[PDB]
């Protein structure tokens, strides 16, 4: 029986083997409480502790499970599916529903998550993310509902594998580089470069941009209206904060689809760098990182077409 | 045949398409020229009062318009336009001069609509891709595919086959002449603006916002509404002093609701159901031309 | 609070279940008061009672259950504020709109099931029972026809589809979109079907002890024409196509119905594609050859409007306008 | 440039050969066609699926890539079958449209550009059989129509799409697991005729006669298009279990357009010798079954090659 290693940021989403008695009979499991929050605070300062231990106790056991909450879920998966090294499959899951509810997602997708990270065939596949009988990659995956236990989709590529009475058929696997693959070590850090969003919509504000650019953020992350466009405003602020050295991301609002390079505005003559497929948050997670290695927007972009 | 006055806020979206005569007399006038990424106050009341004015000397309005910011005029007009003819929007994903351009059949549809007789008292509606969808839950939910404006939580309205519409649902929340909106004496708009929350969300964008005295702030928060720490504190305490907060979600589908994560009577909140948040930015306004206590607002985004 | 009725049609969705072959009435009785004791939280918001009408799982669902629920329906209307129906979810679709259609009463009938199995970790049971009862005890839940609550949402009897094996998220409506979403006990109501259903229908299944038979045959490459003639041969009223695309026929598959329309069988052209209409007259010529395009009606859905239009008409235009208005 | 090869099988997608409807075509490849045959695909059958593998096995050595024009309504079951037959490792992009070519706004036209840049494409290889549609890259396995006249009709629901393609450059970030053309031990090329496989469909109060009908004359194979998870109306239930009996392979799938059909989970699979046809949806599972039973007519074995293609 493998061992593997439930690592929680906060509450509990079931009732630990305990409360779910069953995961003795899959594995041998152990938990450590690494912190306690709401997903809705998480920040720089755990991502890095929870990266750090990950790449700490590595070979002290044969899989990691992630309890997170559900609101920045998509965020920390992508972050550790780029900053992990372990080779060991690291998964991530929460619950849409409260642990004392009728009809409580938690033990189940806890039970999954467990297998999930003791399958042999889930490993090399990058940080995992386990919710409703489904297994899907950090990159790609993302809450589309605020209540609906089934919210977490895979909403451009889709998912890896699906979950049948604790056996898996997986059918796909991601392309983009991760984890040991990636140029990126926190090991060392201490904390990560600013990097903000900004939203646009008719009539949209520049303050915000320009009170970012003021406090002297190293990064903007635009989340676009349509491929990526911007209102006037956020437009000359962002191009102006792109030529005083401020990495400046185009991405978009909208939910799915890419953000695509120089189609409708042209990134070329301003500097800015397109998401591609990469909502705000996750764009915004790429950008920090990427600006603890370079500074320079071609090099960035290069980075977006990679990871 | 049905008269069908065609108002253009921008560029071309087809070529004309010669089979429009067969359905209508179409009247167009250019009313302003811009990309929709840089839609703002200005066209809207413009727009409106426009429709509002011209109300009797046509049978239906159709107003093409760039699929950017489509979902946020659309559903302010749903909110003022006072006439009772059919108001439809159209745009096209694909530039004119493509291959295989979605803007010519997407005109025709919008016309083809617009004449219908069934399609009065619906509310503003929107027509892409073979489907009729209302101004309220429409949204676009992929950068470039043709068949990107879906309304996401409660579906569509008819379907559009051959030239005739097999409408099935009318939307409920009130509309059009049922809203207690009039922005004819009006040439200016409440100032409501956006922030966004993710992990370690900085409260500049959200102080800011504050410190330029704006009327309103919407959240696009993270799951069901919920707010970053930073974020929360400068909300909270601008709400103490009377800026209107309205928690919304950066999630695409679902409600936002009241009083579930966050203790919105203990801090003045409003809750914006199944607004996002660029459309909850639309009837805060709105709502700010009438009243400023949360409750009060609270319960116009439980009607509309 | 409100007197809401629990008509049991099978397995018990929320507790731990009997064993019992529960064909006695009371103790029928006794297993749907079992329900109520394994989600007690359902006694805050209404007096719930019950009994169990059938108990079979609903891969065998037939003609015979749903003139007996509908016209028990129809008979305990008075006695009680509401109906929940409980119900597996293979054939619930069918179930649901048959009810749609011949229910005349005028209080909220609301379905559910489960996808999980009641003793599984997470069973999606108890709180889909739960939100049913709410829905069903919401005086504004009235006058929507039929409803199928599962997953949070409401759902209405004609539109609604299984899009998933497995999954608890399963029932969508798949053309139209829900009628409302639930949260805390609230539902949050911004649309109600807009085709004519229950009271506002001329079906009365009350005298009748049997349906017209109506069957489905499925269209793909070099398919056989065998069970298209099987049916024929056995003298049905009505045969249901699921076809290809927007609704076209396999070239034996054709020849077969057009012969069996001209002599007297009923034919409906409807589709194996899960969304979207079948229209008429777009892919193929149904004046010529006596057939009726089915809408957005699936299937297994096509086939319950052509039995109940069966009872009235058998002239394909007539048994048309039928699919135009229901 | 690549010298890609049209193969037709019905009317034009474009115009109102292709080359002068499409002349931005020449720009990325050069184009041959030749029209195998013209007929709808709500017609399609054995002989043309025989003759269209031949054909690529044939020229396979002769260009760079195919791209097969067919119509919709069976587009989803010719790309399959053609994923378990082709032995070419060049790229074999299938594509239609959803509206007549003579159409205001017509598809079709786009649509082949992306089909002919995409057999172009050196990533595009080594994928299986694909089907290009609405700016979409999709593998022939997950493949599905989805709506009835939507022009975005085309997904994987199961499983997603393997790319996108924006501005003639395609962003490929999955290819299919399961096992495919060159890989799989189906073998085509001295065949004439494949073996007999029929569907039936499952619903309340469904009938037997259906299924009896084609076991009487004999089929191979059955697919059961069930209810929820495979599960199947008493009376076909049983008809079913005898067939197996008399020898007719059975494969269970299901009417419900997504999700896997899993084995042994409601219905006992080996106490009947049925085999469940995971998330292959009936008409998918019938290609499948078809090729399987040229190679056994065991149960135990059909099972594990709809575990494996």
Same mark, same amino acid.
């Given at each position: 029986?493998? /061992? ?13 083997? /305990? ?289």
């Amino acid at each position: 029986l493998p /061992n593997i290693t439930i690592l929680a940021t906060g509450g509990t989403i079931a009732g630990l083997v /305990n409360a779910v008695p069953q995961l003795k009979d899959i594995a041998n499991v152990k938990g450590e409480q690494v912190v306690n929050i709401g997903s809705q605070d998480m920040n720089d300062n755990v991502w890095l502790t929870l990266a750090k231990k990950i790449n700490t106790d590595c070979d002290k056991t044969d899989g990691f499970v992630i309890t997170h909450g559900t609101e920045t879920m998509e965020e920390t998966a992508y972050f550790l599916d780029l900053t992990v090294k372990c080779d060991k499959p690291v998964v991530m899951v929460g619950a849409m529903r409260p642990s004392t509810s009728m009809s409580a997602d938690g033990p189940f997708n806890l039970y999954n998550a467990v297998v999930t990270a003791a399958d042999k065939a889930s490993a090399n596949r990058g940080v995992l993310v386990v919710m409703n009988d489904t297994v899907l990659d950090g990159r790609d995956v993302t809450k589309t509902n605020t209540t609906d236990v089934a919210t977490f989709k895979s909403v451009n590529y889709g998912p890896l594998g699906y979950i049948h009475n604790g056996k898996i058929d997986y059918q796909r696997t991601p392309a983009r580089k991760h984890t040991s693959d990636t140029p990126f070590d926190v090991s060392k850090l201490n904390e990560l470069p600013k990097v903000g969003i900004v939203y646009n919509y008719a009539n949209a504000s520049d303050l915000p941009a320009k009170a970012l650019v003021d406090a002297g953020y190293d990064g903007i992350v635009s989340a676009g209206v349509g491929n990526g466009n911007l209102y006037k405003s956020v437009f000359d602020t962002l191009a102006t904060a792109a030529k005083t050295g401020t990495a400046v991301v185009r991405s978009s609002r909208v939910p799915t689809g890419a953000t695509t390079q120089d189609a409708e505005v042209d990134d070329a003559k301003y500097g800015f760098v397109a998401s591609g497929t990469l909502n705000p948050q996750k764009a915004r997670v790429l950008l920090q990182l990427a600006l603890t290695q370079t500074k320079d927007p071609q090099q960035i972009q290069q980075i977006f077409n990679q990871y």
